[PDB]
């Protein structure tokens, strides 16, 4: 009814740090919430079309759609379609930066250039292959699939010859696509699944060959009116979809997709090629309840938790919906309340633990902060853990290291000098970056509220110790 989103196109999910990424497309921003929908940070907070890099408040987007998350480096790859670019959001350094593209609709069908030297034509989804460090891009404008190499910044064509046609050939130049709007990698990292929007079909792209094979939809030979689109469940060439925009391959190997113009979610088994409808009557509307009687309105993006919760960008309703998949019959689609998401204009947060410290009673002294990790977790060495100090009435207390990075052992020392008789409150906000052996980026956001009221003139040297307590899978 009162959604803070305007036409969200795509989603990505980070399950280890409890983060849901939303492309609020018609507000030209990415919105990060926790998986219960409480606001964490927004990116491109102006809300206006643009193409600027820099901090999360200098930065601007022009209709971002597809999102991909990099768990080893804590980056979000964006498909900035109307800027014809691929943007990279770095959360370690709170800057946005452009990896390829340059703002103008290029007409390059071969490519192979480095960084912003290579132009693009309306990229629409992105998926991140973590092993070979490649970003695959469903380039809707040129009817091809492209490949960004994170190691040399070279962006080249991967498959499709440039013609708009459902043609599943055996080499990159003998295949065609038709406004490919979604892409998801299989758990074997051997195939990618494409939502070939204009051909109204799901296709499987072979990541070694460069070729593709059709899985379901877009076949007129068996369609009752010889139309390549419709709304019909079945197997293979009996299936009819209408403009699927999103596709996701879950770890159980099944393919979840949004049959966008039919306002349904569907499930496709890539070996039987059987497609069944999961949720939605077919009628463009909003109503949630049991799956078979509910309503979406042009769903176009999907993310999934390991547990089995499927999130849906319900784009033409501007909601985020979710479905708990392993409840089977009783399966109901529900809506995600977005708490604290505040629309754009030209302190506190939701993922940050708040620790109250015993009041500091000396006029002057040294405050030692020692953050430790549980066993088996170590500090990241490529992303150093940072802190920043503020005090309740500025200048009530003076701290020399207003900003600092912790030592490799998680410690720092702040020197303080209180100016008044009166009570004040300091807040030490620190982002800690740590990992298990796998080196997947975990992080914790901790803010220490240090109350300050002079009760003695003799210097002291209190200690703040804190153990991080990582999140539960």
DSSP class per residue in 45-65: TT-S---B-EETTT-B-SSEE
Cβ proximity of 69 and 13 under 8 Å = yes
Q: 232 and 121 in one domain? A: yes
Q: 21 and 130 in one domain? A: yes
Do the domain assignments include residue 3? no
Do the domain assignments include residue 347? no
Q: What is the DSSP letter of 237?
A: G
Do the domain assignments include residue 341? no
Domain end, chosen from 308, 335, 362, is at: 335
Q: 222 and 125 in one domain? A: yes
The span from the CA of 126 to the CA of 207, in Å, is 15
Using CA atoms, how far residue 82 sits from 140, 242, 243, in Å, is 11, 24, 20
Q: 408 and 329 in one domain? A: no
Q: 331 and 357 in one domain? A: no
Do the domain assignments include residue 182? yes
The neighbouring-strand residues paired with 434 are: 379, 442
Q: 403 and 257 in one domain? A: no
**Residue of 410, 425, 426, 427 whose CA lies nearest to 466:** 410
**Residue of 51, 52, 50, 87 whose CA lies nearest to 66:** 87
Tell the burial category of 103 from Cβ atoms under 10 Å away from its Cβ (0-12, 13-18, 19+). middle
84 Rama class: left (phi>0) / alpha (psi -120 to 50) / beta: left
Using CA atoms, how far residue 30 sits from 63, 73, 111, 314, 351, in Å, is 10, 18, 28, 16, 17
Q: Which CATH number is 211's domain given? A: 2.120.10.30
Concatenating the DSSP letter of every residue in 269-319 gives: ETTTTEEEEEE--SSSS-B-SBGGG-B-SSEEEEEE-TTSEEEEEEGGGTE
Residue 224: domain span: 11-335
Q: 383 is written with which tokens?
A: 């992303």
Three-state DSSP at 449 gives strand
The span from the CA of 77 to the CA of 96, in Å, is 10
Q: 266 and 374 in one domain? A: no
CA–chain centroid gap for 158, Å, is: 23
Do the domain assignments include residue 342? no
Q: 178 and 275 in one domain? A: yes
Do the domain assignments include residue 2? no
Domain end, chosen from 306, 335, 364, is at: 335
Q: 248 and 148 in one domain? A: yes
Q: What is the per-residue burial (b if ≥16 Cβ within 10 Å, else e) of 236-260? A: ebbbbbbbbbbbbbbeeeebbbbbb
Pairing of strands 123-129, 134-139: antiparallel
Q: What is the DSSP letter of 154?
A: E
Q: 345 is written with which tokens?
A: 């204009």
Method: X-ray
Q: 248 and 323 in one domain? A: yes
Q: Report resolution (Å) to 1 decimal.
A: 3.0
Pairing of strands 442-456, 360-362: parallel
Alpha carbons within 13 A on the beta-carbon side of 144: 24
Q: 382 and 286 in one domain? A: no
Three-state DSSP at 238 gives helix
Domain end, chosen from 335, 370, 397, is at: 335
The span from the CA of 333 to the CA of 289, in Å, is 6
Do the domain assignments include residue 105? yes
Q: 435 is written with which tokens?
A: 């990992």
Do the domain assignments include residue 236? yes
Q: 273 is written with which tokens?
A: 């090629």
- How many other C-beta atoms are found inside a 10 Å radius of the C-beta of residue 106? 17
Q: What is the per-residue burial (b if ≥16 Cβ within 10 Å, else e) of 61-77? A: bbbbbbbbbbbebbbbb
The span from the CA of 14 to the CA of 19, in Å, is 5
Q: What is the per-residue burial (b if ≥16 Cβ within 10 Å, else e) of 311-345? A: bbbbbbbbbbbbbbbeeeeebbbebbebeebeeee
Which residue bears the tokens 């220490």?
448
Angle at 149 between CA 162 and CA 15, to 5 degrees: 105
Which residue bears the tokens 């620190």?
430
Q: Which CATH number is 403's domain given? A: 2.60.40
The span from the CA of 464 to the CA of 407, in Å, is 15
- Domain count of the fold of the chain: 2
CA–chain centroid gap for 66, Å, is: 8
Alpha carbons within 13 A on the beta-carbon side of 190: 2
What value does the CA radius of gyration of the chain take, rounded to a whole number of Å? 25
Q: 455 is written with which tokens?
A: 């009760």
Q: 410 and 303 in one domain? A: no
């Amino acid at each position: 009814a009162t959604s803070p989103l305007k036409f969200p196109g795509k989603l990505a999910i980070d399950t280890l740090n409890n983060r849901l990424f939303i492309s609020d497309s018609n507000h030209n921003r990415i919105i990060v919430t926790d998986l219960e929908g409480n606001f964490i940070v927004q990116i491109g907070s102006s809300g206006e079309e643009g193409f600027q890099d820099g901090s999360f408040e200098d930065a601007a987007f022009n209709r971002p759609q597809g999102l991909a998350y990099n768990a080893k480096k804590n980056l979000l790859y964006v498909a900035d379609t109307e800027n014809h670019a691929l943007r990279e959001i770095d959360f370690v350094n709170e800057r946005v930066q452009t990896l390829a593209g340059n703002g103008t609709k290029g007409s390059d069908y071969q490519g192979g250039r480095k960084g912003t030297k290579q132009l693009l034509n309306s990229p629409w989804d992105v998926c991140f292959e973590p092993v070979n460090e490649k970003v695959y891009i469903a380039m809707a404008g040129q009817h091809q699939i492209w490949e960004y190499s994170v190691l040399d910044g070279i962006t080249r064509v991967f498959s499709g010859n440039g013609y708009e046609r459902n043609l599943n050939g055996s080499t990159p130049q003998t295949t065609s696509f038709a406004q490919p709007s979604g892409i998801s990698l299989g758990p074997d990292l051997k195939e990618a699944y494409i939502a070939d929007s204009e051909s109204s079909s799901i296709r499987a792209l072979d990541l070694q060959t460069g070729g593709s094979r059709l899985l379901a939809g877009g076949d007129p030979y068996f369609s009752e009116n010889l139309f390549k689109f419709g709304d019909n469940d079945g197997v293979g060439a009996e299936v009819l979809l209408q403009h699927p925009l999103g596709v996701l391959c879950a770890n159980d190997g099944q393919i979840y997709l949004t049959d966008s113009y039919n306002h349904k979610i569907k499930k496709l088994d890539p070996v039987t090629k059987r497609v069944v409808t999961l949720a939605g009557t077919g009628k463009a509307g909003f109503k949630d309840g049991k799956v078979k009687g509910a309503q979406l309105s042009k769903p176009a993006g999907l993310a999934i938790t390991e547990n089995g919760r499927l999130f849906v960008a319900d784009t033409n309703n501007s909601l985020i919906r979710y479905i708990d998949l392993n409840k089977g019959e009783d399966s109901e689609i529900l809506t995600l309340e977005l708490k604290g998401v505040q629309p754009p204009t030209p302190r506190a947060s939701a993922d940050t633990k708040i620790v109250k410290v015993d009041s500091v009673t000396s006029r002057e002294g040294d405050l030692n902060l020692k953050i430790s990790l549980p066993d088996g977790y170590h500090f990241s060495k490529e992303a150093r853990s940072k802190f920043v100090v503020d005090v309740e009435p500025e200048n009530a207390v003076a701290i020399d290291p207003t900003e600092g990075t912790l030592s490799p052992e998680g410690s720092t020392m702040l020197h303080f000098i209180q100016s008044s008789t009166s009570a004040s409150v300091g807040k030490i906000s620190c982002k800690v970056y740590y990992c298990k052996e796998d080196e997947v980026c975990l992080y914790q956001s901790v803010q220490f509220e240090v109350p300050f009221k002079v009760e003695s003139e003799l210097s002291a040297s209190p200690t703040i110790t804190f153990t991080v307590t990582p999140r539960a899978p």
